[PDB]
């Protein structure tokens, strides 16, 4: 149907922070391919004047998780955390990034 607006591929953590710090709502997020841990995924989320990062852990059966509940896809991990806080420390609900045409963020080629 429609491609997802939250999968960004291999972008630096600092660039994930640059982009999300321009979003106005807490919870605006993205999933990126980690540079520090090749083959793993990181979830970055705007939270006040900061951006929090979550490491997407994998088990022996290939499932994805952040805390205790395990998922069969990033899509399911993301959708679950739209209604239940992505964090066990503070209440942060995931919400799609909003297009901001006047404020683009650039990565290097």
């Amino acid at each position: 149907m429609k491609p997802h607006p939250w999968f960004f591929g291999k972008i630096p953590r600092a660039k994930a922070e640059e982009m999300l710090s321009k979003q106005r709502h807490d919870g605006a997020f993205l999933i990126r391919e980690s540079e520090s841990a090749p083959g793993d995924f990181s979830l970055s989320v705007k939270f006040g004047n900061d951006v929090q990062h979550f490491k997407v852990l994998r088990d022996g059966a290939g499932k994805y998780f952040l805390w205790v509940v395990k998922f069969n896809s990033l899509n399911e991990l993301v959708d679950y955390h739209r209604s239940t806080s992505v964090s066990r420390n503070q209440q942060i609900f995931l919400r799609d990034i909003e297009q901001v045409p006047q404020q683009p963020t650039y990565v290097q080629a």
Binding site: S42, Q52, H53, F54, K55, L57, L66, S87, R88
Partner: peptide
């Protein structure tokens, strides 16, 4: 990271 060291 929020969830792991």
């Amino acid at each position: 990271y929020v969830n792991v060291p």
